């Protein structure tokens, strides 16, 4: 669908509640952010969590990570999710770009 990134979960209350542990795929799509993981090994994948954009309070990044705060209507529950990554900015431009297009509707 949209851009994909290999990120690692950095502990927060929200990620503990949802059981996030190591590395995951974070992909930015037309209306949401999705967290995917890889099944055993064929390095096979499927969807874990959905963060619809109309349910994201805010998001930020730096050379170390990308973060966001989910609203309480999210399957994840409200709170912050931080993912260590050296492409936080690309993730931020992809998310910002996708929301401005969703909003232009």
């Amino acid at each position: 669908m949209g851009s994909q990134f290999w990120v690692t979960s950095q502990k927060t209350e929200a990620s503990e509640r949802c059981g996030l542990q190591g590395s995951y795929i974070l992909r930015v799509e037309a209306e949401k952010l999705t967290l995917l993981t890889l099944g055993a090994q064929s390095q096979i994948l499927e969807p874990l969590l959905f963060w619809p954009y109309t349910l994201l309070r805010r998001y930020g990044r730096d050379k170390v990570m990308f973060s966001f705060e989910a609203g309480r209507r999210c399957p994840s529950g409200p709170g912050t999710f931080t993912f260590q990554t050296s492409q936080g900015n690309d993730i931020f431009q992809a998310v910002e770009a996708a929301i401005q297009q969703q909003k232009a509707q």
Binding site: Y53, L56, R58, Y59, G60, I99, Q102, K103
Partner: peptide, 10 residues
């Protein structure tokens, strides 16, 4: 680092 998401709640 951060920005508020205007699209929030629409």
């Amino acid at each position: 680092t951060w920005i508020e998401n205007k699209l929030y709640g629409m």
